[PDB]
């Protein structure tokens, strides 16, 4: 049974890796079906527990990706794609 | 620049440290607002590359943790509440 | 030209090792994608792996996992194949093959060498 | 590895016929396939892939179709050069062969 302390430490805005699906960073790129098609990334999650403030990034980064991705009624090849990462995370004011 | 089977690898359907809304895991509870308002808990995260298959849960398992339950313009006291949790995840079709 | 010559095919014998070399010319390796396709006489292709030497990635048939390496050299415009563990029925002419970009498919094997023969017999 | 079934295994035909290989694959259904020619103590030689797609300087008289799991090549008038062996292959890991479809010539 998790004490309070700990469940509010464990909880507050933070980096987490998160896992994120490849579709959802890229709206646009259609003609392509990715595998894996979600990847770990660092992204902000959590919560600051105060109606003013809310978990956002303060540092952002890049990182790229070997990604399988496959043409239907075509072919596939690997090929590098880049995805944001959260570094540093804080409550900020709304 | 991460080589693919190390990404393929590490989003793999699995039970990942999971940030969640107490108030969406529990929509009866109306009158209260929580304090942290969201809690970590161990649940299914990845994918499993295929449209033949699913991510979701074979084991599942209680834990109980102190939350700080706030009546809104009334008063505040902490209480346990128990969460479900995905000890053992695997790619499963409907 | 497009070349892809192959060598070092021989006698191997049961347990014992031998590599496969695919000296390639006109085109650079490193960019491209090489495979390996072997076929034992009077029997059918089958592919047995592939690389793409600028992604650092390689994958084989599960018929020769954990023994099989393919690697290449870019310096020598060469790519290679260590066969260890080998056993009798690996007795196959071994063809180096590449997929070019005028297909978007990795496996679209586009030019061929002649082939070597490689017999695992004592 | 993946399974990979051509029907028919042999056939005979003769000089101007049509012909119809099928390939079988436990494959998903955005996987494709590639379609090749060999001739007795020779290389193969890509003639198709992406389904349908002509790899260059193929003849118009070959074209293919289908996809997801099953796969048809089509020779529209047969000639003396097309007297080989077919074979069909996943575009997909592993990229497996099908076993081969011998046109031998009818006398």
């Known amino acids: 049974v998790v004490k309070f302390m700990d469940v509010y430490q464990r909880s507050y805005c933070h980096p987490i890796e998160t896992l994120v699906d490849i579709f959802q960073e890229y709206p646009d790129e259609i003609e392509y079906i990715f595998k894996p098609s979600c990847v770990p990334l660092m992204r902000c999650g959590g919560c600051c527990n105060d109606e003013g403030l809310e978990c956002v990034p303060t540092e952002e980064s890049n990182i790229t990706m070997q990604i399988m991705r496959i043409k239907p009624h075509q072919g596939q090849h690997i090929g590098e794609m880049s995805f944001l990462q959260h570094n540093k995370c804080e409550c900020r004011p709304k | 620049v991460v080589k693919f089977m190390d990404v393929y690898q590490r989003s793999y359907c699995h039970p990942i440290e999971t940030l969640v809304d107490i108030f969406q895991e529990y929509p009866d509870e109306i009158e209260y607002i929580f304090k942290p308002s969201c809690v970590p808990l161990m649940r299914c995260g990845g994918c499993c590359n295929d449209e033949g298959l699913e991510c979701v849960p074979t084991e599942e398992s209680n834990i109980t943790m102190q939350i700080m339950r706030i009546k809104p313009h009334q008063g505040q006291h902490i209480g346990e509440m128990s969460f479900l949790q995905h000890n053992k995840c695997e790619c499963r079709p409907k | 030209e497009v070349q892809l010559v192959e060598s070092g095919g021989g006698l191997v014998q049961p347990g014992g090792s031998l590599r496969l070399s695919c000296a390639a010319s006109?085109?650079?390796?490193?960019?491209?994608?090489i495979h390996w396709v072997r076929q034992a006489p009077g029997k059918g292709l089958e592919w047995v792996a592939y690389?793409?030497?600028?992604?650092?990635?390689?994958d084989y048939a599960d018929s020769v996992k954990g023994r099989f390496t393919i690697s290449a050299d870019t310096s020598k415009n060469t790519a290679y194949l260590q066969m260890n563990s080998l056993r009798a029925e690996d007795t196959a002419v071994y063809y180096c093959?590449?997929?070019?970009?005028?297909?978007?498919?990795?496996?679209?094997?586009?030019?061929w060498g002649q082939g070597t023969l490689v017999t695992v017999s004592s | 590895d993946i399974q990979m079934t051509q029907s028919p295994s042999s056939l005979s035909a003769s000089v101007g016929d049509r012909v119809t290989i099928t390939c079988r694959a436990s494959?998903?259904?955005?996987?494709?396939v590639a379609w090749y020619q060999q001739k007795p103590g020779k290389a193969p030689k890509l003639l198709i892939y992406?389904?349908?797609y002509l790899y260059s300087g193929v003849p118009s008289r070959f074209s293919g179709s289908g996809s997801g799991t099953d796969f048809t090549l089509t020779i529209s008038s047969l000639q003396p050069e097309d007297f080989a062996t077919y074979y069909c292959?996943?575009?997909?890991?592993?990229?497996?062969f099908g076993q081969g479809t011998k046109v031998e010539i009818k006398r």
């Open positions: 690389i793409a030497p600028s992604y650092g990635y390689t």
């Open positions: 992406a389904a349908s």
């Open positions: 292959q996943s575009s997909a890991s592993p990229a497996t």
């Open positions: 093959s590449r997929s070019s970009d005028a297909s978007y498919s990795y496996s679209a094997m586009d030019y």
């Open positions: 006109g085109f650079d390796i490193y960019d491209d994608d």
């Open positions: 494959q998903a259904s955005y996987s494709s």
